[PDB]
């Protein structure tokens, strides 16, 4: 425990005998060597930022049965756990996507772009002309009115930096966060 607890709980006469004090120190040392670390592990699991690494691995394995995560991608494991558990509340919005992209890719800032399609269906088939939001106002296609589709396409700045690796990381890690009725189509770079 402390350096001289089990020794100090002896009677004042017994503390001055050599063998009894030595035996008390030996027993305390044995208990400190073999028992104490597990008790300290038990008591230190209350807060995420105070647990040891094995308990963090246990918690991440508990979280891993439902999501696909790799802890070496982000800088800190407690940040990973706390932010994933916090963004579970923001299911379906753009916040989880944006924050996960920023967290797991060393600080790339990304904005989500929806895709628009022409209303005129008998002359333009549904999936032949698709335009992202940034190029919607600057185009000449579909020669008519538009509507919103359940499709989206990411836009990324060049300075904040390759396309293939970013793609693979996205399909493996971040796409599982998308709703099942939303379709993701490729990358945009500017």
């Amino acid at each position: 425990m402390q350096r001289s607890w089990f020794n100090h709980r002896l009677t004042s006469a017994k503390q001055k005998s050599l063998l009894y004090k030595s035996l008390a120190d030996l027993v305390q040392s044995m208990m400190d060597t073999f028992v104490d670390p597990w008790l300290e592990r038990i008591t230190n699991r209350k807060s995420i930022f105070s647990m040891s690494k094995e308990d963090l691995e246990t918690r991440t394995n508990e979280l891993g049965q439902f999501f696909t995560i790799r802890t070496s991608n982000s800088s800190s494991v407690p940040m990973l756990l706390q932010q994933r558990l916090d963004e579970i509340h923001f299911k379906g919005t753009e916040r989880p996507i944006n924050q996960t992209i920023y967290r797991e890719f060393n600080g790339i800032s990304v904005l989500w772009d929806p895709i628009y399609a022409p209303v005129d269906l008998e002359r333009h088939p549904y999936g032949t002309v698709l335009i992202p939001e940034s190029t919607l106002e600057t185009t000449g296609g579909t020669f008519g009115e538009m509507f919103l589709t359940s499709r989206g396409m990411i836009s990324i700045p060049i300075n904040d930096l390759i396309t293939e690796e970013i793609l693979r990381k996205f399909n493996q890690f971040v796409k599982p966060l998308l709703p099942l009725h939303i379709v993701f189509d490729g990358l945009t770079l500017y």
Partner: protein, 112 residues
């Protein structure tokens, strides 16, 4: 055979189900009933809850109550000298241990 004293909280074998009894005892120890006694921690009782238990009630197996009321988890950490504690009688805690040991039901449970 080696039995247990009737004042021991270990009479309930599951460490999780003992939480109800511990919660009730601690909630009582923070209230202001008329049957409560006020006891200060003397300089020689810093590391010895057994001495406090013997001096207050006359029973030495009630050291878990003294450990609980001070807000500690182990007996190896010292209590602060001069901390005011309020302690209930022994009969109440004894019947409380028996209650959760046998009935176990929570106070206020509605039955038919």
């Amino acid at each position: 055979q080696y039995p247990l004293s009737r004042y021991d909280d270990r009479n309930i074998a599951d460490p999780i189900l003992r939480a109800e009894l511990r919660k009730e005892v601690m909630l009582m120890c923070e209230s202001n009933d008329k049957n409560l006694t006020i006891y200060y921690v003397l300089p020689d009782e810093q590391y010895r809850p057994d001495l406090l238990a013997y001096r207050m009630w006359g029973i030495a197996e009630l050291r878990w109550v003294v450990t609980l009321a001070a807000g500690l988890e182990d007996e190896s950490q010292g209590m602060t000298v001069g901390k005011k504690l309020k302690l209930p009688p022994a009969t109440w805690i004894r019947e409380m241990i028996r209650h959760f040991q046998y009935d176990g039901q929570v106070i206020g449970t509605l039955s038919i």
